[PDB]
DNA sequence: ATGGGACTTTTTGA
DNA sequence: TTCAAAAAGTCCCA
Ligand SMILES: Nc1ncnc2c1ncn2[C@@H]1O[C@H](CSCCCCNCc2cccc(-c3ccc(Cl)cc3)c2)[C@@H](O)[C@H]1O
Ligand SMILES: [K+]
């Protein structure tokens with residue numbers, strides 16, 4: 080329900096928004112945490128504000144009402160005019176209310192804490208500074224009634240498989256004063272994900288993004304499987320609009336290495352570079368100049384993309400794998416006619432250039448005509464999960480029989496020579512499938528269009544796609560998920576661009592040698608690495624890198 | 625107990 | 639009718 084941001088990050092975000100505030104010019108700054116919780120950020124905002132007022136108390140006393148601006152009145156002034164908080168949890172608000180009160184009855188000091196849905200509250204005024212950590216809820220874990228509200232009221236950033244924190248970005252931007260500064264920590268995925276395209280467009284066209292701190296797959300929150308970034312933006316009048324990008328280099332480092340986050344950012348554990356916000360396309364390609372030069376060379380040289388030459392499709396989605404997937408040595412497969420059985424592989428079975436021998440079998444239950452002819456299969460294998468199967472969406476609507484696969488796709492797409500790759504991996508692993516392998520959605524497949532078979536072969540494609548060049552090339556724009564894991568999904572894999580030049584024959588021949596060695600009984604993996612090194616040199620020569 | 629590594633389902637909107 | 643996206647991942651062990 081409540082997640083605690085590390086103190087080093089909270090202090091960095093508060094200092095990011097307030098360290099250059101001119102309290103003399105504006106002694107009434109409105110600082111808001113829209114998901115304040117117990118007050119991780121607001122309590123630190125109090126301390127920073129208190130030092131700001133006390134350090135200039137005599138200048139304020141001289142410039143303004145001398146009786147009002149006293150050290151004894153700082154506590155009341157902060158709570159009345161400066162600190163604002165909102166959270167849906169009553170108990171967190173009550174705890175934060177006590178913590179703010181205990182920072183110092185005389186007369187009923189009013190604290191601007193609201194217990195509400197920040198996405199529904201009618202905010203009466205805008206704010207100078209906004210900080211905090213919004214909630215993250217995906218499309219599966221969000222209520223259907225609430226999602227209808229979000230789709231209707233937040234359609235500028237929320238669509239399809241978008242996340243809840245997209246709307247908080249929109250709300251924070253909307254209620255930020257002109258010239259104000261916002262700084263939040265959110266998941267990093269919107270920086271590259273397809274769902275975040277509208278959100279990226281909304282941020283780019285409404286605020287100046289001062290800084291992006293990208294932690295990639297490092298674990299910022301303990302015992303939480305999320306990858307985080309810090310976004311700092313303003314609504315100031317500026318003409319340069321360049322972004323400071325801090326991208327981590329070592330994902331295993333501990334965040335408490337230094338007393339402050341800015342020490343870590345300046346260190347060798349991070350890299351810094353600048354991106355012109357006016358040059359951002361629908362995609363935000365945030366890489367240094369060497370990588371940008373590398374990426375642009377490959378883009379310009381290559382004339383084809385995988386989408387042009389290939390047909391992509393996602394694997395089987397049974398809707399209940401335990402009901403339809405069995406070990407190939409399971410005795411219950413004696414009850415199933417071999418015409419119903421398909422080879423079944425997982426992502427771990429995909430290597431470079433080849434697929435491991437399958438150990439599981441899929442019951443393609445869609446080919447079972449009626450319940451009477453194959454009652455034994457239904458009663459003894461599939462029916463053990465009938466209650467769970469009946470709860471699938473297409474079963475409740477009558478589109479699918481209780482024993483059918485939820486998304487059985489087309490058999491002919493799988494029962495052919497094709498290339499398969501895992502949906503999440505640390506490296507490029509594209510394999511030729513010779514054995515008509517089926518898979519779940521953790522493996523993606525594609526086959527070459529007929530009109531392009533004379534230009535590109537499967538052996539050539541796996542040669543370049545598994546090379547170190549294309550491993551680096553794909554990861555420049557790929558979606559970073561967690562420690563040493565990128566998404567390998569068609570929405571980016573099919574955008575990979577490929578080339579064809581005088582090195583085609585030698586590259587294809589080297590790949591065939593690698594494939595031949597990998598399929599032998601006594602595999603000498605040593606020569607495979609040497610052949611791969613030779614191929615990488617050819618590809619680098621081909622692409623002029 | 626916590627931190628780190630291998631591995632990855634099916635619900636869901638369109 | 640039927641596609642493909644989505645980690646506040648999930649789980650195990652030292
Ligand atoms: N709409 C909101 N408006 C304002 N504040 C808001 C709004 N949502 C959230 N918060 C605040 O964000 C603040 C910080 S982010 C964290 C909020 C995530 C809430 N979802 C996650 C979630 C959804 C469903 C069930 C559960 C759940 C229940 C019980 C158990 Cl054992 C385990 C899990 C959790 C928090 O203190 C929140 O009170
Ligand atoms: K005065």
Ligand SMILES: [K+]
Pocket residue numbers: 296297298299303304305306561562
């Ligand atoms: K992480």
